[PDB]
Write an enzyme that holds these catalytic residues in place. Structure first.
Site, PDB file in Angstrom:
ATOM      1  N   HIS A  71      47.968  38.638  21.098  1.00 48.38           N
ATOM      2  CA  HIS A  71      47.254  37.592  21.848  1.00 48.38           C
ATOM      3  C   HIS A  71      45.761  37.917  22.045  1.00 48.38           C
ATOM      4  CE1 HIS A  71      48.355  39.795  25.585  1.00 48.38           C
ATOM      5  NE2 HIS A  71      47.142  39.402  25.969  1.00 48.38           N
ATOM      6  N   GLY A  80      43.249  42.105  31.737  1.00 48.56           N
ATOM      7  CA  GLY A  80      42.634  43.223  31.047  1.00 48.56           C
ATOM      8  C   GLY A  80      43.581  44.391  30.843  1.00 48.56           C
ATOM      9  N   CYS A 104      46.543  44.262  29.512  1.00 50.63           N
ATOM     10  CA  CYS A 104      47.349  44.059  28.310  1.00 50.63           C
ATOM     11  C   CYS A 104      47.068  45.131  27.268  1.00 50.63           C
ATOM     12  CB  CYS A 104      47.145  42.649  27.767  1.00 50.63           C
ATOM     13  SG  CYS A 104      47.627  41.367  28.941  1.00 50.63           S
TER      14      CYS A 104
END
Ligand SMILES: Cc1ccncc1NC(=O)CN1CCC(C)CC1
Ligand SMILES: Cc1ccncc1NC(=O)CN1CCC(C)CC1
Lengths: 304, 304
Positions: free
Chosen positions: A41, A143, A145
């Site tokens: 993503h 952030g 991730c």
């Protein structure tokens, strides 16, 4: 003595954290050998999140669109591929701090440590478990991730989790290091409601053994039970069914304390049916289920 | 979202852990620059523990009696001195992994991470606090002595604790990095009973702000209180008195949530007087006091 929610020492994983930027999205990547792993993503925009077609979005990206920064020095990306929901960015430099590692897919109930990161930098380490509904109750912000979950066996780091998203209910979803989500979750900004968060019975039993070992014994009773009787009570309390395998895994704890596993199940049955009455066990007012039998043995014996 | 008991990433401290052996006692040492810090009780035998005279015991020890092992390579000891309850072993090699560091003496209520070690090797990292009776509720076994407690401010490690002993009640006592014990504890195998373990009120309030930020709001009520009224209730529940300084330190949390500190005190008063009624807050069934206002702000903002 003393029993704490203990995470694995994070140094070996800290040496693997890098920052990955693609477009205007910055998240974390895991640098192992000459490959950087990150959630796919990272290639999405605001309008993509709703219904992304990652094969389509990836066509518009090139090696030079993925900005990989290790510390404050840039890594050259010489290849990129999509494996399930993670991107594998081949860089020209092997990570000099690469520990001995494995990629493993864990089962619900298994615990692991998370090294929460922002902009490739570690902010903290906490211990958590794969819930039986395949969510995790982490502590993640935007952030984070690409932050990973892992286990250590002396010098080998078994990577089991990569953080991808927060569901609308504030719980967390992610993948193993092959890009496969735990559970039915998909990397899309969509209504994904989690299933029943049942209590990991075998873990609660192991933590009751940890309590007896450390002196909290008030909950030990004069009763015993069977697997079938215990499981009737466990189903009623949204506790996972106990199997003979769980009873076997608890063997070392049963042996050290001289308390039969089924006797401990009966003690758990009475705690479920009667509550704690304002009392605590290992400084907790609820039955803790995020310690496996292996974690209790490790903490109580001092494995390094 | 999600609020976890989070420890600081341990890598910078892992690079400082060494094994110290003296006689037949092996414990942990902290290697910073060309000095190794360890508890002075490393020089004691079974018969010494009862009433040791460390100045006397140290006379019979020489530089070559202190065996310092970093990883699996031996460090040459060229000097030794006793500073309060810790030994400072000057070695011929500066620690190449020495981070930027400070030695700080913390106050009761302040939190820190512990990197539990055995034979100079890290086994785990957990977060804990200096209790108001100057004990800590760690998770330590024999051989863990010399494990340290610390805080990190980006790249600087503030060392605040060194583990020395377990009191007969299973709680833990130790020193700051200057060798001064927290509390009235002495490194002797003697009856030392801890004082009242009161609840760190300011920390509980900060964790109630953390709960509101993460969506657990059921406990917010229609009431307010004063410092004097709240403190009457807090004294009754063995909670530390709240000062205007605590109210000020909570300012950032009051501002972010729009909930006045005294309104949150009234919510805490009703939780004290009425219990949780089988409900939970941030997955806990008791009021958590091992998160400072600074820890809540850090975890909720993502400081790295
Ligand atoms: C804000 C936050 C907090 C804690 N953990 C993660 C996040 N971020 C996301 O979950 C963003 N999300 C956007 C849609 C993508 C398909 C997957 C990532
Ligand atoms: C067994 C254990 C468990 C957890 N933490 C520490 C220990 N060990 C001690 O406290 C030993 N003790 C002996 C007398 C000395 C004066 C001080 C050290």
């Amino acid at each position: 003595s003393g029993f704490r929610k203990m995470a694995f020492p994070s140094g070996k994983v800290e040496g693997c954290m890098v920052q990955v930027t693609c477009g205007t999205t910055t998240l974390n990547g895991l640098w192992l050998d000459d490959v950087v792993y990150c959630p796919r993503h990272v290639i999405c925009t605001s309008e993509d999140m709703l219904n992304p077609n990652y094969e389509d979005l990836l066509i518009r990206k090139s090696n030079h669109n993925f900005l990989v920064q290790a510390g404050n020095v840039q890594l050259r990306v010489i290849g990129h591929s999509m494996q399930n929901c993670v991107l594998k960015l081949k860089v020209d430099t092997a990570n000099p701090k690469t520990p001995k590692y494995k990629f493993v897919r864990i089962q619900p109930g298994q615990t692991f440590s998370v090294l929460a990161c922002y902009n490739g930098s570690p902010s903290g380490v906490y211990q958590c478990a794969m819930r039986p509904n395949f969510t995790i109750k982490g502590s993640f912000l935007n952030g984070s991730c690409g932050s990973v979950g892992f286990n250590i066996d002396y010098d080998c780091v078994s990577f089991c989790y990569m953080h991808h998203m927060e569901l609308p209910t504030g719980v967390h979803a992610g993948t193993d290091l092959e890009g496969n989500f735990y559970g039915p979750f998909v990397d899309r900004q969509t209504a994904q409601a989690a299933g029943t968060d049942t209590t990991i019975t075998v873990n609660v039993l192991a933590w009751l053994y940890a309590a007896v070992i450390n002196g909290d014994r008030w909950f030990l009773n004069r009763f015993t039970t069977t697997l079938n009787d215990f499981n009737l009570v466990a189903m009623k309390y949204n506790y996972e069914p106990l199997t003979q395998d769980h009873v076997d895994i608890l063997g070392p704890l049963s042996a050290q304390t001289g308390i039969a596993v089924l006797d401990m199940c009966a003690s758990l049955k009475e705690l479920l049916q009667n509550g704690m009455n304002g009392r605590t066990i290992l400084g907790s007012a609820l039955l803790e289920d995020e310690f496996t039998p292996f974690d209790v043995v490790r903490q109580c014996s001092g494995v390094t």
